[PDB]
Structure formats: structure tokens, C-alpha cells
Design a protein around this ligand. Structure first.
Ligand code: H86
Ligand code: H86
Lengths: 321, 317
């Protein structure tokens, strides 16, 4: 009867979980926290709040949700890309193992979800906030799924520039839109002008493309290691080169771009060969730089504020988010 | 001018997503569906519905939620245990790759979350439903995290039976409870079945752990040994050897688990320690029978509200 008594108690209570247990499974997450970036994201949220006027406490919870989603996304991204370093340091999966890191990142997606409850007690607003959360986590995973598919099954699908931009709207725009949409739903301010969603989609596009561009340009210049080549990613410049070489009939160059991506190599000279093919042969680096400038000018020349509601500064430090 | 026009259209619309895109992202998921198991789960849900009485379209959605979470959690589990097989079939990550399979399984957790908002339009109840989903997903991940931590940090921590049980309550009980709590919250009818479903969860996992070794003893690849899992019979063996001072046997068990071996002969060596030195396989068989009897001898219906047939077939949930 003593075992029966014991089982009886176990099953009539909530599952036992200790603060010691909590710390053990938080290791992969605690490790990525040590990296900087938190204040730059906080800074963009703060600037956007000059329009939305959420009270300090509410804004802090939006910020916590964003940090959990963002950091958990990176933990997963690094396992998905086989990345050995992030912000200059060893990637969590290489320390704690892939199993713990997947589970912990996934665990934090649900802690983020739980925080949404803390934003309001109003039932109609709550429903809306969780919908926004749900929609953008679905968008996020769709774009990421496509990015991974193209890369890992290359050359099955060679994306065009239009496909790439749609993938980024889902993958990168997800977190930017999730944050803005939560703020717009919670805003006490009557009408603070048109929605900023178009503006935030544009920031996400500039962000990803610049990210892609700098990963190669920094290596060309010195700084980095063009780890995107090692990963075989269909980045903005790679997408332009692949489509450029096809439409120009440069058969050998097109096949060599593909061969190098498929090697998943860490040879610096081989990565530099490809980078210089994009520099001199397909003019993909210059095309990309100009594309970025054009995107940034869409905001810098937005005199009638159809996009815009400090923000210029953020744009120049977008790589630091 | 035209570049800008195109960017304007892009940022002013919802992100573009086609059914062809949906199909590429779904492949790792469609693959595990080829696996049977659905019929058995639906039955348990149908049987529990004789007590809950949810209309059938609502019950269909609950069933859809269970299938997404369960199948997705299995896709992730195989990656976490590095399993090559699932029901005699190649696991998805070995076909579609670890990256696509992780993203697709996580995507499906959110497709499941979205189905929840379709269970009702009543706002108070909707909130309760999402809270249930959230809580149990949190419990599920805590339990999985502890299970993995023990295995990957062995031999830093050797769990006790009580620790193993709390882990199971989180890990395995999570989905059983999530399903039942949703069904009880929606019942249009007038004692809770959670204790019973928790007990089903514990029987489920201990029997799963038991058959993994017992199927191999009688022929089963005993993959749990290769993975180095702190399974119920191994927890019993490690603590029995510790307790009895059997220092070398204690260390030989750890050594074999730490080898991550596929060698049949070495895996049998582990099973002979369990069968001849600690009698852990027998002890486990007895433990499961005692849990099952709590239900068999529940004449007052303290736990209960066919279920017995399901319990002896629980091994295919
Ligand atoms: C506070 C206001 C919002 C700030 C959001 C800042 C980041 C949003 C844009 C980047 O989001 C992602 C999503 C994701 C991501 C998205 C998912 F949906 C899943 C996932 F696992 C990762 C990954 N990454 C990693 C990058 P990288 O390794 O180059 O720094 P990349 O490999 O995607 O280019 C970035
Ligand atoms: C009333 C009907 C309710 C739903 C019935 C089914 C409930 C789930 C039963 C299985 O629970 C799990 C959770 C999980 C699981 C739980 C998590 F929290 C995360 C995860 F990734 C997997 C995994 N597994 C896989 C097993 P195995 O590989 O032996 O088939 P095991 O590895 O637990 O032994 C099973």
C-alpha cells in the first residue's frame, strides 16, 4: 500500500519541477545571453515607442518576449547551419550538444508565449496578441524552411530574386513584424498615423541583405570568414550571380558557383575565388551594394513620410541588431 | 523607379507563401505520417469522449492537435537520440536532413497552436484553452530536457526512482494531460480524469522502457542502451548496485552506457547484469503490473470514471 500511496500522491499533483532543474536546462540559453546585441534591439523598440507610447512596464515585457524569441531562433539557426561561432564565440550546440540546445531553444519559445499573458487582462486584446504571436512564428518558420530547403537540396531549386525577397519577408520580417504588431495593438495612442508595418518590413529586408553582403565583403576586405559560403547559403549576392550567369550563358561560372557551394568548404582560398567571381565576373557585390543603397534611400528620401511615421542612426547600425 | 515600385508592393502586402512552398516544408512531416499509430490514439480519444461528449467536429480538431504535437515531438526526439529507425522505418532526419526536420517539426507545433483558436470563439474559454496548451508544452519540454541532461551529462547525476518518476510526469504526462484537459474544459457535460491519464502516462513510459530491453533479451535492437538512456530498468540497476556496494557492477553498467555501443554482444552483457545481478527486468515487470492493478482493482471508480484493453495495448499509442 506504500507504493500505491506514493503513486497516488504523484498522480494527484502537478508535475514536480525544481529551480535546480530549471537552471540545468537553461545552460544553452544562458550561454548565448553573454553575447551583446540586447541594447541595440532595445534601442529600436524604444525609438518606435515614441510613436506607440506603451507604458514602461508593458514595453519591458514586449522586450523580454522579443529577446527570448530572437535568442532561441539563433540557437536553432546555428544548429541548422552547423555554425561554429556566433558574435565571436563558440556556439552553444558545440558545448552542450545538439539535443539540449534544440530542446532549450524550443522550451524558450513557449516561455515567450507565456509572457504574452502578462501584457493585458482584457480578453479581446489577449486573443489578438496571441494571434499576432502565432502568425509571425508561423511566418518565421515558413521562410526559414525555404532557406534551409534551397540550400540543402541545391541545385534542385535555384531561387530568383523575387523568391529570395519573399523568403526574407517570411523569415526575417517575422520578428520585426511580431514586435511592431504587438506594440501597435497595445498602443493607447488614438491615431498615431499610418501603420509602420511597411516600414518594418523594409528594415527587415535591408537587414538581411546587408547581413548577406557584409558576410562576403568583410572577408574580401580582411574581419570575418565568409561562413555563408561554407554553409552553402543562397544569399542575395549568390542568388544574383546564379541568375546572372544563367541568363548570360556563362555555363562554366554558373556550374563552378554551384560546385563551390556544394563543397561546404572552409578553404579560405576557395572562398576567396568565389567571392572574386562575384566581384569581377558577375558584378554581384556591386549590384547588391547598390540594391541596399536604393532600399535605404527609399527611407532617406521619404520626405512625405509615407513610410517613416534617430531612426536614420538605427538604419546605419542595423547590422548590430 | 521600377525597383522601388516593386519593393513598395512587397512591403505593403502580407508575405507571399504558395501551396507549393507549403508542400516543400511538409515533407519531413508527411514521411512520419506513413507510420501507423493514429488509429490507436484516436481510439483512446473516442473512448474518453464517451465521458466528455464533445460534438464530433470539435473532437476532430482535438484529435488533429494531438497528431501534430505527437508526430512533431517524435521527429525531434529521433534527432535528439540520434535514432536511425522509428517503427522499422528510416527516420525523417536521415532522409530530409537534421536542419529541415527540426524546422518542420517546430513549424507544426505552431500549426497545432493555431488549431486551438478554432476549438471555440468564447473568449474566456479560448484563453483557458491556450493556457492549457502552453502549460503542457512547457511541462513536456522540461521533462524532455531533464531526460536529455541526465543522459548527456552521465555520470554526473544518477537519478533515483522518484526523480525518474517526476521526469516522466513532465515529459510523458504532458501530451496525455494536454489532450484530456482540453477535452474536460470543452465538455458540455456535468471527477476529473487527470490522475488516471497521469497513471496511463507513467505505465506508458515504464512499459516502453521495459520492452526496449525485453524485446532484445528475447531476440528488438535495445537502442536505449546505445543512446545511453537513464531508462526505468537502468535507474533501478544503478541504484541497486550502489545500495548493495557492488562497486564493479555499478561501474560496468556505467561503462557500457557511456560507450554508446551498437555491439550486440556488449549490449547483452548489460542485459545479463540486469537479469542475473540486479533482477531489474523482473522488478520492472512487477512495477508495471502493480500500476495496472491500481486500475484493475478500482472498484470504487476512484480513478476510472475497454480502457483495460487499451492499457494492454498502450504500447502502440
Ligand atoms: C527587437 C526588434 C526585432 C529585432 C529582430 C532582429 C533579428 C531579426 C532578423 C534576423 O532574424 C533571424 C531569424 C532566424 C531564424 C528564423 C526562424 F524562423 C527560425 C530560425 F531558427 C532562425 C535566423 N537568423 C540568423 C541569421 P545570421 O546567422 O546571418 O545572423 P540568418 O542565418 O537567418 O541569415 C536571424
Ligand atoms: C488521450 C491521448 C493523448 C495522446 C496519446 C499519445 C501521447 C504521447 C505518447 C508519447 O509521448 C512521448 C513524448 C516524447 C517527447 C516528449 C517531449 F517533451 C519532447 C519530445 F521531443 C518527445 C517522446 N516519445 C517517444 C518515446 P519512443 O522513442 O520510445 O517511442 P520516448 O523517447 O519518450 O521513450 C513519446
Amino acid at each position: 500500500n506504500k507504493m500505491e500511496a506514493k503513486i497516488d500522491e504523484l498522480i494527484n499533483n502537478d508535475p514536480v519541477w525544481s529551480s535546480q532543474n530549471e537552471s540545468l536546462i537553461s545552460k544553452p540559453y544562458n550561454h548565448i545571453l553573454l553575447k551583446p546585441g540586447k541594447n541595440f534591439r532595445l534601442n529600436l523598440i524604444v525609438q518606435i515607442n515614441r510613436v506607440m507610447n506603451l507604458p514602461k512596464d508593458q514595453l519591458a515585457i514586449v522586450s523580454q518576449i522579443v529577446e527570448l524569441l530572437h535568442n532561441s531562433s539563433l540557437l536553432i539557426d546555428d544548429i541548422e547551419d552547423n555554425a561554429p561561432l556566433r558574435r565571436g564565440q563558440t556556439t552553444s550546440h558545440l558545448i552542450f550538444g545538439v539535443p539540449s540546445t534544440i530542446n532549450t531553444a524550443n522550451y524558450m519559445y513557449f516561455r515567450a508565449m507565456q509572457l504574452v499573458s502578462q501584457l493585458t487582462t482584457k480578453e479581446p486584446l489577449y486573443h489578438n496578441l496571441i494571434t499576432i504571436f502565432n502568425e509571425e512564428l508561423i511566418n518565421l518558420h515558413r521562410g526559414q524552411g525555404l532557406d534551409i530547403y534551397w540550400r540543402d537540396f541545391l541545385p534542385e531549386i535555384i531561387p530568383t530574386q523575387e523568391m529570395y525577397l519573399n523568403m526574407v519577408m517570411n523569415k526575417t520580417g517575422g520578428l520585426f513584424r511580431l514586435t511592431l504588431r504587438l506594440m501597435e495593438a497595445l498602443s493607447p495612442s488614438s491615431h498615431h498615423g499610418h501603420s509602420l508595418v511597411p516600414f518594418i518590413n523594409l528594415l527587415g529586408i535591408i537587414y538581411q541583405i546587408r547581413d548577406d553582403y557584409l558576410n562576403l565583403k568583410d572577408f574580401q576586405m580582411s574581419k570575418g570568414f565568409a561562413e555563408d559560403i561554407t554553409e552553402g547559403k543562397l544569399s542575395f549576392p549568390i542568388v544574383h550571380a546564379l541568375n546572372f550567369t544563367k541568363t548570360k550563358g556563362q555555363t562554366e561560372q554558373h556550374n563552378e558557383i554551384l560546385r563551390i557551394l556544394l563543397l561546404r568548404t572552409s578553404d579560405k582560398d576557395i572562398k576567396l575565388k568565389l567571392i572574386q567571381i562575384l566581384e569581377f565576373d558577375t558584378n554581384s557585390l556591386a549590384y547588391t551594394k547598390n540594391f541596399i543603397n536604393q532600399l535605404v534611400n527609399m527611407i532617406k528620401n521619404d520626405n512625405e513620410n509615407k513610410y517613416l511615421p534617430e531612426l536614420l542612426y538605427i538604419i546605419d547600425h542595423l547590422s548590430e541588431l
